[PDB]
Amino acid sequence: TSSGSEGNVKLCSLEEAQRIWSAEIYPIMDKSSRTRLALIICNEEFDSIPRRTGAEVDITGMTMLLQNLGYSVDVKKNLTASDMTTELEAFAHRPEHKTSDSTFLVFMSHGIREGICGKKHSEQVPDILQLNAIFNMLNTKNCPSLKDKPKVIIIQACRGDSPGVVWFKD
Amino acid sequence: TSSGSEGNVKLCSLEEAQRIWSAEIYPIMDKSSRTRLALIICNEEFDSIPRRTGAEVDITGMTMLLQNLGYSVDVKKNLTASDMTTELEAFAHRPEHKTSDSTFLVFMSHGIREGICGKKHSEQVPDILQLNAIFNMLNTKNCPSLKDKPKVIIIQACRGDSPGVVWFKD
Amino acid sequence: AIKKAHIEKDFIAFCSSTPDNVSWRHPTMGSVFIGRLIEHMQEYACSCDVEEIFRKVRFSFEQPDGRAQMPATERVTLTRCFYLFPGH
């Protein structure tokens, strides 16, 4: 049934979990006590770049999915690269990570080759967050609470202007 | 026995191959007709950077391993970034890729954050090959013969000056 | 007592396209990569680790249309398999 907390996510049965459980799997904390956190940053309204219509569908979908997977989801919208940095730094400082076993970070915006566009981005005055900065803010040095724990980063954005295709004949 | 063509590589038996064989596996060409190619570029002697002592051990090890796995191995030594580019371009044009199912590319040199050092590299006059260039030269546009075929890139090099560690207490 | 730990470990990034290339978003249906990811997570979280799920997502994009993209995993330092074990 989809009426449960896991919604439309297919459940892993007790017998299938034991079939998987190897010494090469990340440990899962007790469901009763764990405090899983996830962060979604989605830029829809921009100063100079066209409106990202349909972004609300992405927000709804990802928020519900991560909740289904057991994560408490923070949603932050329409941020500059500076604001995204401040938000990432605050997320890294969250006390819940200490009693968590993993995290998800979701970024959704316009993008270029260099990285992810902030709300104020233009070709004249770039407002970009690099993927490198995301890793740095979440690593063992800057986020010791997530040491040894899977950190999953999801990015929806262009990485350039090319259609990504080439022709071939049969 | 290690006297065979596969040397010290543990063999996959016929029964274990059938247990693996799913529609999510890369196809393997007939052993009798296929012409697998691999390229090793190893920079040991440099103009301004210290000698990479022990690089011959790496060359021997990787060459024998790739041969064990069925690849005919080209070994090129002490090249500038320009020479590496020319060598990559020539490798992409090899007719054997058409009758191959995969390829391995191995790069071994001094390295910085930006990429892999050529033989003439110095801090004043950089001689660097970027990982981005390696991908571009081997993609579907520049190497159509390797379309739909696994391209494995192995890089031994520093990616900066940091020890890569942080302290924590119990 | 103090002990050394790797500064960067247990990361996986998954991008909507390859470098230089566009990613697509439907005005009413949402981002293609996002929608595809949710569907695969809903179906395969029970049986597959995250790396395998992401591979499956990549496979679903294989046959290119007028609006093509190939998602890519980046800077991966996962040392173990990450299973979500949904329901547990």
Place this chain on the structure above:
Amino acid sequence: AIKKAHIEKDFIAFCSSTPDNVSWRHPTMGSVFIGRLIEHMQEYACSCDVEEIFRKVRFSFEQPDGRAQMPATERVTLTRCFYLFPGH
């Protein structure tokens, strides 16, 4: 007739360390990453796909010493599992 194909697909890169960080080479024994890779390829090529083998290599580096490094897979667009099937 002509058909579209993804410009970049079926790639996997495996680097000796993480960005910003050093990789180690023994003067007589050779590069640590290279040696470790060969050992894992020799042992696991028969039973594991390349992505899994690379994961195992990463795990073997987990406990840091005086000369630490964490290998990382990069820019991965493998859409299928790549098994070497050694001997075939």
